[PDB]
Each structure stands twice: as C-alpha cells, then as structure tokens.
Amino acid sequence: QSTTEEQAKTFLLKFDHDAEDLSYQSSLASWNYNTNITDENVQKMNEARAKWSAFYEEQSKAAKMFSLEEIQDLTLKRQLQALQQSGTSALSADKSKRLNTILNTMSTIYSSGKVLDPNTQECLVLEPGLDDIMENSQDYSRRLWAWEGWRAEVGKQLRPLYEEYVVLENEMARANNYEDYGDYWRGDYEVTGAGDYDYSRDQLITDVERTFAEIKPLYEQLHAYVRTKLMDAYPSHISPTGCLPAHLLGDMWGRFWTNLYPLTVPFGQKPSIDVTREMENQSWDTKRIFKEAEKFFVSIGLPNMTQGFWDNSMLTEPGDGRKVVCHPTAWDLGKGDFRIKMCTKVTMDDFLTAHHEMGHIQYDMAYATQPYLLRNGANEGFHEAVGEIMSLSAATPHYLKALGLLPPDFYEDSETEINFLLKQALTIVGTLPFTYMLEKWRWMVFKGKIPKEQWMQKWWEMKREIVGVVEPLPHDETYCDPACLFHVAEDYSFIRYYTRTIYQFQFHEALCQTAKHEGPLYKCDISNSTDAGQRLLQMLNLGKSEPWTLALERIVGAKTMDVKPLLNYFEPLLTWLKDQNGNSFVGWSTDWTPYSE
Numbered sequence: 001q002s003t004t005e006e007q008a009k010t011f012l013l014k015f016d017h018d019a020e021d022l023s024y025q026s027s028l029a030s031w032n033y034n035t036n037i038t039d040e041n042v043q044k045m046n047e048a049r050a051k052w053s054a055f056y057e058e059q060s061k062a063a064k065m066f067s068l069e070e071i072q073d074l075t076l077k078r079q080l081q082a083l084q085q086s087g088t089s090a091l092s093a094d095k096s097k098r099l100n101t102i103l104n105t106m107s108t109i110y111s112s113g114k115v116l117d118p119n120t121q122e123c124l125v126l127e128p129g130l131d132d133i134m135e136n137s138q139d140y141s142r143r144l145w146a147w148e149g150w151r152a153e154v155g156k157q158l159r160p161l162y163e164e165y166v167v168l169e170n171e172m173a174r175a176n177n178y179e180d181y182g183d184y185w186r187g188d189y190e191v192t193g194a195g196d197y198d199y200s201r202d203q204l205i206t207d208v209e210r211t212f213a214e215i216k217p218l219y220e221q222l223h224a225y226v227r228t229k230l231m232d233a234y235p236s237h238i239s240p241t242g243c244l245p246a247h248l249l250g251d252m253w254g255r256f257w258t259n260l261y262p263l264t265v266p267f268g269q270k271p272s273i274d275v276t277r278e279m280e281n282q283s284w285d286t287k288r289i290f291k292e293a294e295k296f297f298v299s300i301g302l303p304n305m306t307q308g309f310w311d312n313s314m315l316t317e318p319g320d321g322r323k324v325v326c327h328p329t330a331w332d333l334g335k336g337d338f339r340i341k342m343c344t345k346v347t348m349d350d351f352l353t354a355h356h357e358m359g360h361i362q363y364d365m366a367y368a369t370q371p372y373l374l375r376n377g378a379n380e381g382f383h384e385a386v387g388e389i390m391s392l393s394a395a396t397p398h399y400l401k402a403l404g405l406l407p408p409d410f411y412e413d414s415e416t417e418i419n420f421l422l423k424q425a426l427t428i429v430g431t432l433p434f435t436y437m438l439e440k441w442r443w444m445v446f447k448g449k450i451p452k453e454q455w456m457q458k459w460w461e462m463k464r465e466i467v468g469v470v471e472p473l474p475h476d477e478t479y480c481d482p483a484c485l486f487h488v489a490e491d492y493s494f495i496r497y498y499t500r501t502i503y504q505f506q507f508h509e510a511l512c513q514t515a516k517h518e519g520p521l522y523k524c525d526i527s528n529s530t531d532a533g534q535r536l537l538q539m540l541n542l543g544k545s546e547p548w549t550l551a552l553e554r555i556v557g558a559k560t561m562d563v564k565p566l567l568n569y570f571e572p573l574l575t576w577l578k579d580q581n582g583n584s585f586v587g588w589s590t591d592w593t594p595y596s597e
C-alpha cells in the first residue's frame with residue numbers, strides 16, 4: 001500500500017541520524033568557542049553553523065512533498081510541521097537578498113552605540129560607563145544628560161530600517177499563508193485536532209488583558225506607596241501625583257531597578273537576609289553547593305548531573321590567559337554529553353543561579369528519552385519557568401536553617417520578610433504590567449491599530465494616560481526609542497518573559513498544593529516530600545510529547561491562565577496596603593504634566 005508515512009519515517013530516521021552528529025560536533029565545537037575565543041575557533045563555528053543551516057533547509061524542502069494531512073498522529077504531525085518551515089526564501093531573490101543585507105547592517109553599526117559627555121574629560125560607553133550613570137546614581141542632571149545624549153544620536157540612523165523590516169516580515173508572513181506578522185507570531189499557541197484540550201490564537205490576548213484587570217488594585221496600591229517614597233528624591237521636578245520622567249526610570253529601559261535599593265528601603269535599620277560570612281566560616285565551596293542541592297532533588301527523585309559534569313565542566317573561569325563568557329549557560333550537547341559553564345562565586349545570587357543551572361538542565365534529562373526532535377520543553381515559557389521555581393525553595397528560611405546556612409535558633413521577623421517581597425517583586429513582578437502593556441503596544445503595532453505616521457509618538461502619547469510615564473522632551477518622527485535595546489534589532493520576542501512568569505507561579509502553586517503546605521503561599525516548602533516528586537515527574541517525563549495546555553493541567557489541575565495564586569501570594573500585602581490610600585490620591589494625575597506647564 002506504501003503509505004507516505006512509511007517513507008517519511010525513514011526520512012525522519014535519516015534526518016535524526018545526520019542531525020544528531022551534526023549538532024553534537026557543532027555543540028562540541030560550540031563549547032570550545034565559549035571557553036576559547038580565537039581566530040580559528042570562530043571560523044569553524046561559522047562553517048559548522050552554515051552546514052547545519054543548509055542541511056536543515058534541504059530537509060525543509062524534502063518535507064514539502066510529504067503533506068501534513070497524511071499523518072494522523074498529533075505528535076508525529078508536530079515534527080513534520082516544525083521541519084516543513086522554510087523561512088524567508090519564499091519571496092523573490094531580490095527581496096531576500098535585501099533582507100540579508102539589512103540584517104547585516106543592524107549587526108555591525110548597531111552594536112557601536114556611543115554617547116557624548118558635555119565635558120570632554122570623561123568619555124563613557126554603554127558597557128559599563130553609561131550603565132553606572134543610569135542605574136547607580138543619586139542625582140538628576142547626570143541621568144538627564146545621559147538620556148538626552150544617547151537618544152539624540154541613535155534614532156536618526158536606525159529609524160528608517162524598522163519600517164522596511166516590518167513590511168518585509170509581513171510579506172514573508174503572507175507567503176506562508178498567514179494573515180499578518182501577528183498571526184505569524186500567534187501560531188506558537190495554536191492547537192488543532194487534539195479536541196477540547198486546545199487553545200485559540202486570539203484567546204491569549206483576551207485572557208492576558210483580563211488578568212491585567214485583577215492586577216490593577218494591587219498595582220495602584222504599590223505604585224502609590226513607591227511614589228510617596230519617591231517624592232523625597234526629586235521634589236523639585238515631580239509632583240506628588242505626577243508621572244516619573246523617562247530619564248528617572250531606573251535604567252535605560254525601566255527593566256532593572258535593583259541598584260536603587262538604598263533610596264527606597266522602607267526599614268533601613270532592619271538588615272536583609274545575608275549569611276555570606278557564614279559559609280566562609282564553614283569552608284563551603286562551589287562544589288559543596290552542588291551536592292547539598294542534590295539533597296533537595298533526591299527528596300523529589302531527581303538525580304545528580306552525570307559524571308561528565310564533574311571532570312569536563314569547570315566551575316570557575318580558567319586563569320591560563322583565555323577569556324570566556326562568564327554568563328551562566330545551559331548546554332544540551334546531546335549523545336549523553338552534557339557540559340556546564342559559569343564563573344560562579346560564593347554569593348546568594350550566584351547561590352540561586354547555581355541551582356537554576358543545575359535544575360534547569362534537569363529538564364533536559366527529563367525529556368532526554370524523547371526523540372531528538374521532541375527533546376525540548378513544552379513551549380518557550382515552560383523551560384525557563386522550571387528552573388526559576390527550583391531556586392524558590394532553596395531561598396526559604398527553613399531550607400537554609402536545615403542546610404547549615406542559618407543558625408538553629410534563628411528567628412525571622414515579619415519586617416525582615418518585608419524586604420524579600422519587595423526584592424523579588426522589583427526583580428520579576430514589577431515589570432509584568434510594563435511587559436504586558438509593551439506587548440500590547442507591539443500587538444496593535446502588529447495589528448495596524450496604531451497609524452503608520454504615529455508609530456513612535458503614540459508610544460509617548462498613551463504613555464501619559466495609560467502607562468503613566470511622562471516624557472521630559474518631545475521628539476519628532478525621526479527618533480526610535482526601541483533602537484536603544486540590542487534585542488530589538490535581533491528579533492527577540494517579549495511575551496516569553498510573561499509566559500515564563502505566569503507558568504512559574506502556577507508551578508509553584510501546584511507544587512505547594514501537592515506539598516499540602518498550610519497558610520500564605522510564601523511560607524511554602526516542598527523539601528523531603530517524596531510524594532510531591534512523583535507528581536513533578538509526571539510533567540517532566542512528557543516534555544514536548546504533549547501540549548502545554550494538557551501538560552499544565554497535569555501539575556496544576558486546570559487548563560487556563562490563572563492569577564488567583566498570585567493574589568493569594570500577595571494577600572498579606574494587599575490587606576496591609578488597602579488602608580494606605582486614605583491620605584493619598586490613587587492613580588497618576590494626568591492633569592499636571594512637567595513638560596507643557
């Protein structure tokens with residue numbers, strides 16, 4: 001009968017056999033570059049990546065004559081659907097070539113961003129001279145001049161390419177039978193043929209906006225409290241009900257505000273939890289962290305890293321003159337070979353990133369038994385949310401008390417707990433309204449709601465009423481604020497962070513419900529509960545074999561976005577905050593603006 005599937009299976013077997021070795025020596029070569037950057041190394045990475053991309057493109061062509069309706073299995077259909085994608089080659093040669101030469105332009109000059117100090121004696125760049133200026137500062141004029149000087153230069157040259165890039169991305173989107181660029185990016189959450197365990201492309205936009213509404217009371221309370229704290233910082237340019245200027249947004253993008261800790265501390269006489277001296281008095285090294293971490297994983301059934309970790313992977317930067325990338329990285333080389341790199345140190349932040357790197361790799365070991373094309377997470381957010389929830393339990397006071405990092409008689413005060421809330425909110429949660437509304441801006445930009453002639457001026461126009469941030473000096477159409485971020489030029493999605501955050505909170509709530517912990521969610525501990533690990537394994541094993549819809553239900557019990565765990569987690573803060581607005585106005589007053597009047 002010779003069903004097409006019986007030859008597509010042989011084709012997929014050949015593809016797996018070739019691609020396993022291809023990526024394995026590519027990843028082996030990839031490791032040799034991160035740990036050793038030379039002239040020879042970059043060349044062979046370029047050759048290997050070019051060969052891999054060419055082979056993938058040939059296999060994408062070879063997937064074309066075998067249709068998708070000839071496979072009834074959903075899991076097998078997913079592999080062909082992933083492989084069938086070609087890319088930008090669908091249009092004519094000239095448009096594709098202009099795409100490649102435009103992408104080259106945003107690679108070279110874009111990375112050479114420069115600012116000019118008013119005084120010539122000091123010259124600073126974005127890394128790290130400027131970053132100190134925006135983030136680590138306690139004055140107004142330095143931030144103002146940095147904002148003006150940086151934004152004055154980069155917009156003019158970089159604005160015109162964005163519209164051409166957008167229209168060309170739309171043209172490739174239409175080439176692949178998609179309605180627009182939004183539908184091109186909204187296809188990552190579409191499930192068809194599964195049944196009731198499905199998700200709609202437009203349902204994500206509607207549900208996220210609905211979840212934003214429940215955030216608004218707590219967001220207003222917190223923003224009012226932080227504003228009342230902030231009037232002591234800039235009395236002469238900010239009204240007690242006015243918006244924060246764009247040059248007092250914490251940093252370049254408003255994403256990281258961590259360095260502003262000394263100014264906005266509620267209780268400055270209560271010290272934060274910092275036991276850094278204690279492990280230095282107990283001779284704890286980075287290696288010892290990895291085995292005490294295992295003690296938590298064995299409680300949930302997760303084993304340790306393979307033997308190749310102990311010898312091949314280095315726990316610190318080499319000192320033989322070779323310069324490396326010190327960012328902690330997660331590597332899945334394949335073929336049972338796994339290597340792990342970071343310039344870790346004995347610090348609490350590195351203490352958490354060590355468990356992230358250990359635990360986020362553990363996801364790879366969970367689905368390592370899946371086929372090579374199914375050796376991935378459920379989606380973009382699941383993989384990056386599994387790692388973060390691991391360190392949540394490692395930072396609990398009980399875990400440190402039982403691990404020797406805390407005294408046996410140590411008692412934590414509720415005022416001490418107050419710092420931990422503000423810290424992790426300021427790190428992860430505080431940007432959730434910002435991230436959601438920025439992606440709303442992009443979606444209406446993608447949907448065409450924002451007219452083409454006001455693409456950048458409505459970013460500032462709705463900023464007055466909706467974003468509640470006032471600009472210090474209006475700029476004309478030539479300027480491009482998104483050009484200040486390196487990720488924009490490289491086409492990096494921003495909904496991944498929001499999905500990761502929501503999935504991480506859902507995972508934490510599900511694990512705590514399984515752990516049968518009682519009380520507010522922040523006191524939850526899942527250590528030593530062997531029954532809680534079997535439930536986790538039920539979700540870890542599936543990997544990419546099942547959709548996120550059903551994978552989320554396997555651990556949580558529901559197949560919908562939920563912010564009730566978030567409200568429960570912040571319940572004490574709400575109960576302590578609702579009375580605060582008695583003597584303060586709620587929201588940001590749009591009547592008073594610093595720029596016009």
Ligand SMILES: [Zn+2]
Pocket residue numbers: 330356357359360361383384387
């Ligand atoms: Zn990770």
